[PDB]
């Protein structure tokens, strides 16, 4: 009964630990000793985008590398043109408590969500010349923490109730559900080829999910506190986590264990966001000490600092062509670096 | 040339700069309380108008917004506590049911001792005030707290004991004033009390931003 199953679970955990131990024949901290350092990286602000009336909580770059969308605590979305700094759209929401954004790959729709347990989908191309709500998805129990499009027809969301869901937009019903976490889920990230995804959920644990089959495949552990950010390495077989104990880490999906940790003794504050550069050589991280750090992914050293915001950096993103960086903070400004 | 994009952007800025004036007058108050604290009756007797509920009203030409978190408040997570722009927190706590005081105390010392609410003052409404009087004249308050010193059948002693027991839970008392009141079914002066406490909070803030101490 219960005791035999528990014993078998313990035996399998011992097997997993032994299999992970037996594969550690080398490390990046030694193999990467033949890599020339990237040197000192220096960046300057090109544009400053003004107009939000409160804290900024999310952003997402478009797929043409020119338009972007952001959401604020006063309950608004703004769609910006960044080459000229012109505002293209300003969308007012139904409730001021918003926490996430997404921008569709084709450019026809956007989405948002928050403490109302509902995900709203807006249509940007109508014959009447306005923006109207196309769909409202309801059925979650906790608040909404992240949302990412797959195409014009399907979406995937994560909640603060230990669940994730894949939805078909046309009918509005949950096509599949993913369960297994114990605490609230903070963030998820999609694969480049759009077949799998990863999520981190306040257990200091991360899980890898298959979209269509609907089960968890791998589980990674090692942090000491909540995981607040996650993203994929460009070729889709690695990912990086940022947590609330002032530490980032790198995981590989095939070796099933950790490779490097990124942390320095002068940081005593947690992470808010991570992202990679186009070739995978730089890792950008945002902190609660008002600055952003640019790390060398392979040697685990500090290559640069971005400073100029006066409050916490909460949002951070890199374009699809790789020619700019955008940061958003609690002082209600967006900045573009290049 | 197609530079009408710039003119369109200027038109959008003309509306943002209009709403910026209204977003600097509104006063936000976060409402908390127990399950049996008469919360529904308290709010429904003020003549005002599931995720989050919001209520709007006006006192002396000042707009007040009351934000009610209906049972989602049990979350012990920092990211859920994104209510740090509020002017004050308003607790409704019962005192007539002597077996429910420990729960309210444990809720209170859990909320007040949090960091994120260091810049917000706190108001405390001891509720119904009369079933407590009936209990005192029939039963003694020593049967639950073996810490009271005084007359078990005097209402004043009970009131001071409860108020001091609540005030003893907080630390760093001087950060922001803590007010308390006794209300039964008044419903008509509650606006006066909340207005006065918020006004005193703003006055203390001004005495400090102007470098007067």
């Amino acid at each position, epitope marked *: 009964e219960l005791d035999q199953l528990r014993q078998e679970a313990e035996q399998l955990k011992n097997q997993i630990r032994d299999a992970r131990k037996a594969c550690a024949d080398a490390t990046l901290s030694q193999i990467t000793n033949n890599i020339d350092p990237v040197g000192r990286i220096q960046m300057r602000t090109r544009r400053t985008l003004r107009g939000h009336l409160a804290k900024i909580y999310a952003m997402h770059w478009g797929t043409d590398s020119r338009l972007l969308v952001s959401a604020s605590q006063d309950g608004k979305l703004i769609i910006w043109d960044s080459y000229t700094t012109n505002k*293209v759209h300003a969308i007012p929401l139904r409730s001021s408590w918003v926490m996430t954004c997404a921008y569709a790959p084709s450019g026809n729709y956007v989405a948002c969500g928050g403490l109302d347990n509902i995900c709203s989908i807006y249509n940007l191309k109508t014959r*009447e010349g306005n923006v109207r709500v196309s769909r409202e998805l309801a059925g979650h129990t906790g608040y909404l923490s992240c949302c990412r499009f797959l195409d014009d027809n399907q979406i995937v969301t994560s909640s603060g109730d230990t669940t994730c869901a894949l939805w078909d937009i046309e009918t509005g019903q949950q096509t599949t559900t993913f369960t297994g976490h114990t605490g609230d889920v903070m963030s998820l990230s999609l694969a480049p080829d759009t077949r799998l995804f990863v999520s981190g959920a306040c257990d200091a644990s991360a899980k890898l999910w298959d979209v269509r089959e609907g089960m968890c495949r791998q589980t990674f552990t090692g942090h000491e506190s909540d995981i607040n950010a996650i993203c994929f390495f460009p070729n889709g077989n690695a990912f990086a986590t940022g947590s609330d104990d002032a530490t980032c880490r790198l995981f590989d999906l095939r070796a099933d264990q950790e490779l490097m940790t990124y942390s320095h003794d002068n940081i005593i504050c947690g992470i808010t966001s991570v992202s990679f550069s186009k070739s995978g050589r730089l890792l950008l991280a945002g902190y609660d000490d008002f600055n952003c750090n640019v790390w060398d992914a392979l040697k685990a050293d500090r290559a640069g600092v971005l400073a100029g915001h006066d409050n916490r950096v909460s949002c951070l993103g890199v374009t699809d062509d790789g020619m700019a960086v955008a940061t958003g903070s609690w002082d209600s400004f967006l900045k573009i670096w290049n | 040339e197609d530079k009408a994009a710039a003119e369109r952007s200027k038109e959008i800025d003309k509306c943002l700069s209009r709403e910026k004036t209204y977003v600097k007058r509104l006063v936000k108050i976060l409402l908390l309380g127990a399950d049996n604290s008469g919360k529904s009756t308290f709010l429904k007797q003020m003549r005002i108008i599931k995720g989050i509920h919001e209520y709007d009203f006006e006192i002396k030409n000042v707009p007040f917004k009351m934000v009610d978190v209906g049972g989602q408040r049990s979350e012990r997570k920092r990211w859920f506590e994104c209510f740090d722009s509020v002017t004050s927190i308003l607790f409704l706590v019962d005192s007539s049911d002597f077996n429910r005081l420990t729960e309210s105390l444990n809720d209170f010392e859990t909320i007040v001792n949090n960091r994120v609410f260091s810049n917000v003052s706190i108001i405390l409404f001891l509720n119904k005030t009369d079933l407590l009087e009936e209990k005192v004249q029939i039963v003694s308050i020593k049967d639950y707290f073996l810490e009271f010193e005084g007359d078990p059948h005097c209402l004043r002693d009970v009131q001071k004991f409860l108020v001091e027991c609540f005030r003893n839970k907080r630390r760093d008392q001087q950060q922001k004033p803590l007010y308390h009141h006794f209300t039964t079914a008044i419903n008509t002066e509650n606006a006066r009390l909340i207005f006065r406490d918020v006004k005193d909070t703003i006055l203390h803030d001004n005495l400090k931003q102007l470098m007067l101490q």
Partner: single-chain antibody
Amino acid sequence: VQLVESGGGLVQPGGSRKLSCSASGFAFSSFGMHWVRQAPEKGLEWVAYISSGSGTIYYADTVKGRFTISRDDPKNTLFLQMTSLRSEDTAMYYCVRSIYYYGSSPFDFWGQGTTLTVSSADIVMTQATSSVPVTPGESVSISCRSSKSLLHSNGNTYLYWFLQRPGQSPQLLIYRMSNLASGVPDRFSGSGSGTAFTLTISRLEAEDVGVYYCMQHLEYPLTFGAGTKLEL
């Protein structure tokens, strides 16, 4: 979406007239509006422009000081007040819709127009021909030329192609020299380079005959071409 015009008829030399236009089915206060004109047996000619928020107003060279454009948003109405009429003002007048932001499609809906009868450093655009006999199932091309280069330093080429069928208002085919409009079948194409542009129609079908026009939108005033007719 619908735009309906009123105010036409017969007028004596001198005198005055007022034309009005009523819009229904869209957000009138977010669009800019044009008044365009067509002589009885000639091509199209542009008359006036009013912007959103009533900030900018433009007139043609041969109408300044006599014509006035105005709009009313809480009733969705547009007015053209016109005075001191000559015999050269006899024409059919259309009202046109246009919205400008990054990636939009101007000139994409025309009204039905009204008839009014009365008792240079500009860019020049030239059509190749006045008529081209065609047969169904063929592939045909049209071309037009300009006196300047329409390519700007930001990467856009401002050439527009419209088609007018017998008895109907014009319709947008191509905007900014390469792009298709909504609802236009993908058998139309257009390309070229500075000072030489060509439109290609593949597999001609019925109800695809009429007159074709090319227009520029680089600087005001906006000017039209002479017109190419296809006969089946």
